[model samples]
Target: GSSGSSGMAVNVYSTSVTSENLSRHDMLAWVNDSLHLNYTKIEQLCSGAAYCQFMDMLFPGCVHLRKVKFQAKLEHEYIHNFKVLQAAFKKMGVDKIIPVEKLVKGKFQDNFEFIQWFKKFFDANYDGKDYNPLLARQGQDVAPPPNPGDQIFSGPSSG
Candidate 1:
């Protein structure tokens, strides 16, 4: 429902977006060519490899925040951080991605009311909806439409 994320979403998306200037078929091709464990010919094995990278960044945020909270604030902190997170999602058009406009509408008579709405909106839906461990990979494991990561666009070993 959002890029409301603090790191994982941003980080994974960055990896997919950054290597654009340098793209290719197999990310693990070189390593596979290492003769150590090449799954290139099997193709979907590469898909599994990519999912491992995607899966790696999933929960680093909560762990990070759990630690940061000891060094954090109360009301003002929650409000400010919440707004920052919402703003990040807004810029990413996250609401647009979800059915937020359809699920919510009009204007609240008070900013407080609106704020409460958003809090409820997320708390009920998105806050923990991003990933569910028992169900995270439950029904999803195929390649999720990522192009590639080959530094070879510049040259075989030098991007």
Candidate 2:
């Protein structure tokens, strides 16, 4: 007589959004070749309040990309959108949730180049005239301007 097991073990594989697994250059090439969009045009039209709203609607649960803090003016909108894209993947549960350090080391480092490419591709497709009021309304309740005494920095002296 033999004992039988009713269930079989399943192996699951997961990936994450990071610089290595998602290269911007490769993304740009793929978008240009596959989507038939102009990269230069997208870079120019990625700025402004309307663009942010559009992105929010197109991708839910990931609107922060529109309001990225930059040290200098940028000509492209796709880079910001890429951040949102990664967030979207998280929201959709496509990638496994793991520590940031491990995720960065395992996936981000490998795909960074592809991410850059994709960002450029996004910038090219952006058009200022195209606006979606619905998405704009969705992001209306996000973080407001900080009040005085808010923890703006990470130091005992400031707090």
Candidate 3:
């Protein structure tokens, strides 16, 4: 006899968004709607100073909130989406129209700051732990620290 177990898996597909594939407005709409949240509630709950400190520690490259910008080229549909997003953000009291050219030029320090910001924002709104099993399992079975001269690389080390 044998016991059975069940689990679910989600398949995520990755695609590069290019000017030919999507329009600028479409991207904007996605960003505005997807990243949209109640700032009034966020301000009331999370300490701005504390959040800034945490953000600085997490993203040393770019910590200022005002320096962030979004950019993408779009056809008619994408332009509409982008406008919708911009309008939504405007409705939420954000007024900043940064040029995408600046963003592409690496005008900001580390772009990963945006990703971290989004993650933190989403996590604040939702309740649950973000899990990455591969990262968690790293070095779990490691023994004593390696010698200074020992070579280190991927895969199991042979004794």
Candidate 4:
């Protein structure tokens, strides 16, 4: 055994820091009510279809919801949805680069940040008019994931 110092270390504790006005729960409530969809977590928005319709709800006629993939599962499908969203952003003149690569992962933190940023934009641009989500979606049926935890966990398993 080799000893360099005998009594040179001391005990320490742990800590954290944070700040906020709106929380993920607040965004979830807004999405579920406005979109009329059953979403328990913010990560569900990673599909990007909801964002496209949400853009339509806010700006009206800006986003063509016909192109959105509500049941997007594969990465390419998700990219397609994000492409629709990016087009909406361009149409709306919103100067923001969507981190599509990060968002497609469906992680809570990345999606939360984007959703938080979106909430600010929504607050600024919301027309306060009654809009129907299903009608806007052209009555497209969204198939809920068979298993909640499985979707996120299964994402990184292959390749």
Find the candidate with the highest TM-score and give its number: 4
Q: In angstroms, how far off is 106's CA in candidate 3?
A: 6.8
| TM-score (C-alpha) between model 3 and the true structure | 0.24
For model 2, how does the per-residue alpha-carbon lDDT over 107-155 read when each residue is reduced to its tens digit? 4443343334334434433433444343432455665522223245554
In Å, residue 77's CA in model 1 sits off its true spot by 44
Top-lDDT candidate index:
4
> Per-candidate RMSD vs. true structure?
19.6, 17.5, 21.9, 18.2
Q: Name the regions of candidate 4 deviating beyond 4 angstroms.
A: 1-20, 138-159
Worst 10 residues of 1 by lDDT: 63-72
TM-score of each: 0.20, 0.24, 0.24, 0.70
lDDT of 4 by residue, 1-159 (tens): 476422121211223464444777788877777777567889988888888888778776667777888878787788788887788667645667889898888899998878877766676666468887766545335744222242444445656
Candidate 3 per-residue lDDT over residues 31-133, each given as its tens digit:
3333331222221111122222223222232243322222223223323323333333334333334222332333233323332343434334333434232
Candidate closer to the true structure by TM-score (higher is better), 1 or 3: 3
User: What residue runs in model 3 are displaced by over 4 Å at the alpha carbon?
Assistant: 1-83, 94-99, 104-110, 127-159
Off by over 4 Å in 2: 1-26, 30-58, 70-87, 96-109, 112-159
Candidate number that wins on lDDT, 1 or 4: 4
